[PDB]
Design a protein around this ligand. Structure first.
Ligand SMILES: *SCCNC(=O)CCNC(=O)[C@H](O)C(C)(C)COP(=O)(O)OP(=O)(O)OC[C@H]1O[C@@H](n2cnc3c(N)ncnc32)[C@H](O)[C@@H]1OP(=O)(O)O
Ligand SMILES: *SCCNC(=O)CCNC(=O)[C@H](O)C(C)(C)COP(=O)(O)OP(=O)(O)OC[C@H]1O[C@@H](n2cnc3c(N)ncnc32)[C@H](O)[C@@H]1OP(=O)(O)O
Ligand SMILES: O=C([O-])C(=O)[O-]
Ligand SMILES: [Cl-]
Ligand SMILES: [Cl-]
Lengths: 427, 427
């Protein structure tokens, strides 16, 4: 049916990393119960609101397919309700600060006692055992810790944060792998396990190519395909040349390919007044004769100075800027169309507005309009993985404490004692 | 014991997205057999080599914990062998061009017939159903398609690619989620499924927050926390201050926080000569009194225009520029120390050099030294998820066709059958 039908998730998560994880689990069928702080709830509810006193898109786009119960966990009644909820859980997920769940009495060893089958899943800034394991980390600090900021941006500019969430959402997706892997062994062992993902580690995983380049740099003293190795091309703020005779750590490469097939961000008609009027253009080696046809340079097919990676490696930026002259009267889509004819790897910079309203993305269920008959409908990113056997069924994000009574009734409590919980301000 | 012990993976993958997926499965215990092209194999082998005739770091860092068999798939004998291996496998992973696996005999339907239990998993550039479904895509082409490039970099500069592999390694990790979930649902149904991740979609999932902001911008006309909403701070092509008056698609915010928690990338001692001499300084909501003690300005603790987020939103760049001048005489670790005592979300930009040789990442198994007796030892990224019950054991990447005979013998083929295949140039 759905892969995670019948998986009960006890969801302590707030902000983006942990909530990304449990939402996606909900999309694949999981029964997700989100524990929130009394009164305020998850911080994302009040962050970046578009309508005063309505849960922000920060919350709703990260908390569909969930039920909400308010709970003070620093109370003896709270800790007992938790213990019951743990015993009915398949997976516990949390992204509090280091040691926070521990100080609430819920260490991994006490969890194993409560439920031998329950998996504990954590997001933390740094890994257990790291000198920095006790630090609290948000999105951009995480990008800085993992090598991404150092290797993103231009050579004459600062380290640059990525708009893609390398810290939060990426750690949550990585945590989902750990959880599903724990489920795979549990079928063998009949036991739960602790799984943790550090935000620094998740970033380092996406920056595997830069660790490749660090070693290449150490071993050979040069990265020939980098802009800093191109003849008289890269310079710092004072006009000093930037070259590898001076570079001991992977530099920022601007819009360079990043791997074995050179590329660049090329202006298309309208770039002066439209921030996204660009294509990315890749010189794939198997594609060079086709590139020569497209740009009307037949003399470049048989020239050893042009017809191999090695020959072009000292003239990359010359070739890119000449190719770019061909795009001056064409918008990004017609350039993309034109290259597509030759089979050349080329594509548009898609604007957020263009993606938000693209028919193909809605048709495939990657951009989903959520039916929210309380707040009004909104877009979300759906499941990025498509399956032959099932489609996700995305339902609206809960109001704060909307399923508190519904959830307490599922624990076999009666109307009288649940009123005591509201009275004692535990719920 | 490891989660994926006894899971058999028939691995068609090449380049980066697919190999990352299968390597990481191999790290979790899976038996990975990699089909490669005769003579040249996976194209990463001869890309960005540091030594002539030695498999590159591009190949070894994406291909540990795998065996190699050479195979010409478009021969009758190749298709015959492929059919035998499909019946042994639990998971088939591929990232060929659109329809390429179909064209050599093996459609999803034909695969089901061969093995009702096998899961087909694919990385594509665009989702099946998409208008751009036909397009072959590389790393940065996907980053542009998925909205990352449009929202990364500066307002006065071009769309900017991320050093992090949002297209390749990220889609591969997303595909691993899809495979594992298909393994969960196979415990019920007793049948395999087809699963696919589009590179555009994996990129989009990490820019969920930018789709949040797109709706915020369409709904309200402004994004208050963005630099373009700051009084006389950012400027345009000629000199005019920017505003959201004429911005209808999510813009580039430079080093802005990207969320409800503000931030900026601040210079440290030696920034002129060291590109990574920087910290990121976040201003969390509750952590405000801690910050006021450091800046040598206790005026802001009571000041109505400084103690609220709605009060701070109109002078964000005034505060960041001043606290930068304090850091002029301290390096990035001293600045982070000067702030860790307050639990302030400040962190250093870590260089690739620092990360490759950091003691903590090695201790926790995130940067791993692979024992490679053929080529020499190299570094790699290990498993970014940490488990209580096991630890990955990372073994060197195979030589081309290193295991061909060994793999062929496992299918019960005699020495004569093997030598016939070598002579006929099938293997
Ligand atoms: S997506 C980017 C966010 N980063 C991460 O997910 C990385 C891991 N998380 C963290 O480092 C922090 O949790 C972040 C998200 C940075 C936020 O830090 P805060 O300091 O604002 O919040 P904490 O999680 O550290 O929680 C503080 C204390 O409050 C207690 N608490 C939470 N919820 C409840 C409820 N419902 N009832 C009672 N107490 C509750 C936490 O246990 C924590 O306890 P302490 O003992 O005081 O630390
Ligand atoms: S980091 C992520 C990179 N990109 C992706 O993973 C996205 C999906 N893959 C692709 O878009 C392409 O595979 C890319 C990476 C762009 C490479 O393009 P190629 O020009 O190399 O095209 P193919 O990889 O699909 O290969 C071309 C033909 O060769 C056949 N083939 C592969 N391997 C063999 C072996 N061993 N034996 C015989 N034939 C083989 C493919 O089936 C394909 O067939 P055609 O029918 O000719 O297209
Ligand atoms: O990064 C890439 O994909 C490249 O360079 O081809
Ligand atoms: Cl996020
Ligand atoms: Cl990659």
């Amino acid at each position: 049916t759905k892969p995670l039908d019948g998986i009960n998730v006890l969801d302590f998560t707030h902000v983006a990393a942990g909530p990304a994880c449990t939402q996606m689990m909900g999309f694949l069928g999981a029964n997700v119960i989100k524990i929130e702080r009394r009164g305020s709830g998850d911080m994302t509810r009040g962050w970046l609101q578009d309508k005063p006193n309505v849960d922000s898109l920060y919350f709703t786009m990260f908390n569909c397919n969930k039920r909400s119960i308010e709970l003070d966990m620093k109370t003896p009644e709270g800790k007992e309700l938790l213990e019951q909820m743990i015993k009915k859980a398949d997976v516990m997920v949390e992204n509090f600060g280091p040691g926070a769940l521990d100080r609430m009495g819920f260490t991994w060893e006490y969890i194993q006692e409560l439920n031998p089958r329950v998996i504990l899943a954590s997001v933390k800034g740094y890994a257990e055992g790291h000198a920095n394991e006790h630090l609290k980390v948000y999105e951009n600090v995480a990008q800085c810790s993992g090598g991404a900021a150092a290797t993103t941006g231009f050579w004459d500019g600062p380290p640059t944060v990525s708009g893609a969430a390398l810290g939060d959402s990426n750690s949550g997706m990585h945590l989902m792998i750990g959880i599903l892997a724990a489920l795979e062994i549990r079928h063998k062992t009949g036991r739960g396990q602790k799984v943790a993902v550090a935000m620094q580690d998740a970033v380092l995983n996406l920056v595997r190519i830069k660790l490749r380049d660090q070693q290449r740099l150490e071993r050979t003293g040069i990265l020939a395909e980098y802009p800093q190795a191109q003849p008289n091309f890269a310079f710092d703020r004072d006009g000093n040349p930037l070259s590898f005779d001076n570079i001991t750590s992977v530099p920022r490469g601007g819009n360079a390919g990043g791997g074995g097939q050179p590329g660049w961000m090329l202006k298309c008609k309208g770039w002066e007044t439209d921030a996204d009027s660009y294509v990315y253009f890749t010189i794939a080696a198997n594609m060079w004769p086709q590139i020569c046809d497209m740009i009307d340079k037949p003399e470049w097919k048989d020239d050893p100075a042009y017809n191999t990676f090695e020959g072009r490696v000292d003239k990359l930026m010359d070739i890119f800027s000449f190719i770019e002259t061909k795009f001056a009267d064409k918008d990004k889509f017609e350039v993309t169309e034109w290259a597509a004819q030759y089979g050349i790897p080329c594509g548009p910079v898609m604007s957020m507005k263009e993606l938000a309203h693209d028919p193909s993305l809605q048709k495939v269920g990657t951009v989903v309009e959520v039916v929210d008959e309380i707040r009004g409908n909104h877009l979300t990113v759906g499941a990025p993985f498509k399956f032959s056997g099932f489609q996700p069924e995305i339902t609206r994000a809960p109001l704060l404490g909307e399923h508190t009574d519904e959830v307490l009734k599922e624990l076999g409590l009666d109307d009288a004692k649940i009123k005591e919980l509201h009275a004692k301000q535990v719920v």
